[PDB]
Amino acid sequence: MTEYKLVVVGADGVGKSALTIQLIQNHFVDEYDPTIEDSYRKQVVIDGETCLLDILDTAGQEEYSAMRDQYMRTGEGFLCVFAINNTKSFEDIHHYREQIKRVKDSEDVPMVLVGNKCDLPSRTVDTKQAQDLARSYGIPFIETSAKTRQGVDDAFYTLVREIRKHK
Amino acid sequence: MTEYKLVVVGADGVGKSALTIQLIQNHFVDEYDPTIEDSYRKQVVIDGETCLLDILDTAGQEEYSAMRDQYMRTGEGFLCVFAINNTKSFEDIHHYREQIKRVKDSEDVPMVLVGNKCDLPSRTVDTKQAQDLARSYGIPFIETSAKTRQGVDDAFYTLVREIRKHK
Numbered sequence: 616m617t618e619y620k621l622v623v624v625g626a627d628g629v630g631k632s633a634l635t636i637q638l639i640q641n642h643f644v645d646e647y648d649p650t651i652e653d654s655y656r657k658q659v660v661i662d663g664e665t666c667l668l669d670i671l672d673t674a675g676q677e678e679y680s681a682m683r684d685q686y687m688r689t690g691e692g693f694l695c696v697f698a699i700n701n702t703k704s705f706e707d708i709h710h711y712r713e714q715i716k717r718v719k720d721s722e723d724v725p726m727v728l729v730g731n732k733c734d735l736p737s738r739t740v741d742t743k744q745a746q747d748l749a750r751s752y753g754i755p756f757i758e759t760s761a762k763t764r765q766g767v768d769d770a771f772y773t774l775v776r777e778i779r780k781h782k
Numbered sequence: 783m784t785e786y787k788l789v790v791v792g793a794d795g796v797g798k799s800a801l802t803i804q805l806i807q808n809h810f811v812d813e814y815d816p817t818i819e820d821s822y823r824k825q826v827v828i829d830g831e832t833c834l835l836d837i838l839d840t841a842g843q844e845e846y847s848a849m850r851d852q853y854m855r856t857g858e859g860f861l862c863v864f865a866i867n868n869t870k871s872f873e874d875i876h877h878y879r880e881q882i883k884r885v886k887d888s889e890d891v892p893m894v895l896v897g898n899k900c901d902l903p904s905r906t907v908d909t910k911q912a913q914d915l916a917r918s919y920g921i922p923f924i925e926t927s928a929k930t931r932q933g934v935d936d937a938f939y940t941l942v943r944e945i946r947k948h949k
């Protein structure tokens with residue numbers, strides 16, 4: 616059985632946990648409980664292949680930034696999440712991308728840029744600006760909502776497809 | 783900060799995941815999604831001490847029984863869960879306890895016997911029979927409900943106290 620080690624990264628509050636819990640439990644969490652480090656294992660069928668996804672839900676809190684080194688060395692693909700109503704979270708993306716690139720010593724790391732909270736009317740980040748950043752990295756860009764489940768399966772499945780390309 | 787490595791074990795369907803999700807997220811999961819292996823890292827205050835709980839939510843499915851050796855070596859304390867309306871899950875307790883004892887090469891492993899689903903009227907295991915088994919092992923016994931939260935904090939906090947009391 617093909618195993619894929621996925622790591623969900625991004626600023627504190629973008630919805631990493633809500634995206635992961637929506638994917639795993641089909642449940643939206645309204646509460647904000649800052650994560651230290653949670654992991655999940657889930658069997659899924661992607662393009663007719665039975666995949667085992669090992670998902671790491673990481674801390675966005677900068678106090679836990681020392682923990683990044685290990686998971687960036689072991690992770691195969693990275694879901695880089697910002698929130699479309701939080702300008703700073705979009706600005707933080709490039710810091711995550713640069714750290715992943717430095718740890719892996721590569722510009723070809725499987726990654727997907729995710730613009731979460733697309734259900735919210737309070738947009739502050741233009742879809743075009745996010746599409747342009749993903750193009751500069753050569754990676755896919757998908758808008759999601761952990762609340763409605765819009766784009767959630769697509770974001771994770773696209774990341775698995777990126778890891779398969781790389782291998 | 784004192785870290786406690788807790789492992790939730792028991793037969794397929796007893797409510798290991800619902801207990802863990804209730805403890806951490808304060809809500810009840812009605813769905814039945816069989817676990818492979820999930821982990822959670824949560825900060826809690828127990829008896830005025832800031833504890834880091836590393837909780838392993840394991841597979842009850844006998845197909846994943848080979849995975850036990852690793853988590854039984856790493857785990858410091860074990861929540862041994864049966865469901866009060868499932869006699870087979872109560873009989874399976876002895877097998878989990880024997881396996882933990884053999885892996886750790888000790889008779890004094892921190893453990894708590896948990897009789898879950900105490901909200902259900904369909905009881906098949908008498909409280910006295912479970913109390914007698916827990917006495918024979920020299921471990922605490924608590925009845926819980928992942929639905930109502932009855933005994934949930936007490937089961938996990940008692941296990942932390944067992945790891946701490948064994949120290």
Ligand SMILES: Nc1nc2c(ncn2[C@@H]2O[C@H](COP(=O)(O)OP(=O)(O)CP(=O)(O)O)[C@@H](O)[C@H]2O)c(=O)[nH]1
Nearest residue numbers: 627628629630631632633645649650675732760761
């Ligand atoms: N409306 C809406 N709210 C969302 C969405 N995703 C997450 N949220 C909300 O944003 C808040 C933060 O979500 P959370 O999943 O904890 O974010 P996180 O990035 O994991 C936080 P940390 O880095 O500390 O672990 C929560 O209140 C949650 O309900 C979304 O797609 N839509």
Ligand SMILES: Nc1nc2c(ncn2[C@@H]2O[C@H](COP(=O)(O)OP(=O)(O)CP(=O)(O)O)[C@@H](O)[C@H]2O)c(=O)[nH]1
Nearest residue numbers: 794795796797798799800812816817842899927928
């Ligand atoms: N009434 C009631 N139902 C419960 C309780 N705990 C779990 N359940 C129900 O039992 C079923 C199984 O719960 P779950 O937490 O998945 O059990 P599990 O032991 O983790 C299953 P696995 O070993 O395959 O991972 C679910 O339908 C869940 O809602 C409880 O305390 N009371």
Ligand SMILES: CC1(C)C[C@@]2(C)c3ccccc3N[C@@]2(C)N1
Nearest residue numbers: 620621654669670671686689690
């Ligand atoms: C591979 C490993 C043993 C280590 C871990 C922390 C991790 C790292 C990257 C991606 C997923 C994932 N999950 C964990 C729990 N499993």
Ligand SMILES: [Mg+2]
Nearest residue numbers: 631632649650
């Ligand atoms: Mg989180």
Ligand SMILES: [Mg+2]
Nearest residue numbers: 798799816817
């Ligand atoms: Mg489970």
